[PDB]
Amino acid sequence: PVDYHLLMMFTKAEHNAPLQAKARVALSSLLRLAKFEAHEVLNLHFVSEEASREVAKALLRELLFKCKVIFHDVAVLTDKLFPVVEAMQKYFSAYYSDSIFFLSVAMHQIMPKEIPRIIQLDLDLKYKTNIRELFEEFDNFLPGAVIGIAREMQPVYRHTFWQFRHENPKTRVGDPPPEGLPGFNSGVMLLNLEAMRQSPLYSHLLEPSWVQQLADKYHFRGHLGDQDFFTMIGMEHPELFHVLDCTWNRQLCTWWRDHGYSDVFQAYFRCEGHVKIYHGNCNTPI
Ligand SMILES: O=c1ccn([C@@H]2O[C@H](COP(=O)(O)OP(=O)(O)O)[C@@H](O)[C@H]2O)c(=O)[nH]1
Ligand SMILES: [Mn+2]
């Protein structure tokens, strides 16, 4: 048998109608279109609390290749994360309870060594293709590339990196694609735990003094959590990241188009081609 792992955040879903609607659109599209071979098996991980764990199990019954469903305890992962991720919530969430928002960053240390690869996914997504196809992007990784991640389709990182761009007028940090680095979106993340455990550079970029050094270089104080870490790391060492085509995560949020970036917005939001996964971020309907 061959294992394919997906991870999803499903916290505070109890008495949440907007969230449960999203998780219905997401999980229904995922499973209705997901097709695997008979020997191999799809593993669906969830980090949820006892309360939302019930909500998930109840939702999966309506929608059930074998597909094993694993539930991770929110508190257990948080408690495991905290000693590793304390020194970077003061830069990317600029107190203890909010350690679970940096899960992707330390996925290799939290997950068992038995798991070599995982795809962490948002629940405001809509799947337009078979999810087995996305796993094929792992093969397109360069050696020394640890994370598969789609680029950010809003000029958020213009505003976040403002002081660095103010000081470096020639920089590509915060610039639109294809010539510039717009930053990353955390909605669809291909985490190569095997590569993460083995990459010395990534092992060092997780350390406090390194984080401090790099945040200070970019004058970085963000609020986007794990997404902020990868994005900032992506500016220094872009080769750690395998940039997924925009069609694998087409964010639909247009907030910044109407709140300051009307002119440059398109250069970030643009994504030509047949969409494979939609991302209805900032509550944008699909
Ligand atoms: O109350 C919540 C809200 C969100 N999420 C999860 O965290 C992810 C990030 O939230 P959201 O989609 O709002 O992020 P955005 O893409 O809007 O920045 C979602 O996909 C959900 O899986 C959660 O567990 N509880
Ligand atoms: Mn989202």
Q: What is the largest CA-CA distance in the chain?
A: 56
Q: Note the Cα 187 to chain centre separation in Å.
A: 4
The reply, when asked if residue 124 is annotated as ligand binding, is yes
The reply, when asked if residue 107 is annotated as ligand binding, is no
Sequence-distant (≥ 6) Cβ neighbours of residue 27 within 8 angstroms: 59, 60, 63, 123
Omega before 200 cis (within 30°)? no
CA distance 269 to 153: 5
Q: Which helix (H) or strand (E) holds 184?
A: strand 184-191
CA distance 45 to 68: 8
Position 18: which residue type? P
Contact 264, 180 (CB under 8 A): no
Q: What share of the chain is helix, strand, coil (3-state, %, to 5)?
A: 45, 20, 35
CA of 25 to the centre of ligand 2 (A): 13
Domain ranges of the chain: 1-286
**Order of strands, sheet of 3-9, starting from the edge strand that comes earlier in the sequence:** 66-73, 41-48, 3-9, 118-121, 184-191, 147-151, 241-244
Which residues precede a break in the chain, with C-to-N distance above 2.5 Å?
A: 64, 94
CA of 226 to the centre of ligand 1 (A): 13
* Residues contacting ligand 1 via CB (< 6 Å): 8-12, 19, 122-124, 187, 281-282
Q: Whose CA is nearest to atom 1 of ligand 1?
A: 12
Q: Whose CA is nearest to atom 18 of ligand 1?
A: 281
Task: Report which ligand 1 atom has the smallest distance to the Cα of 279.
Answer: 16
Position 49: which residue type? E
Q: Angle at Cα 172 formed by Cα 168 and Cα 176, nearest 5°?
A: 135
CA distance 142 to 4: 20
User: Is 125 exposed, middle or buried, given 0-12, 13-18 or 19+ CB atoms closer than 10 A?
Assistant: buried
Q: Which of 119, 183, 176 is nearest to 157 (CA)?
A: 183
CA distance 153 to 171: 19
Q: Which of 190, 218, 188 is nearest to 94 (CA)?
A: 218
CA distance 162 to 268: 16
Contact 116, 192 (CB under 8 A): yes
CA of 1 to the centre of ligand 2 (A): 32
Which technique was the structure solved with, according to the deposited record? X-ray
Contact 164, 219 (CB under 8 A): yes
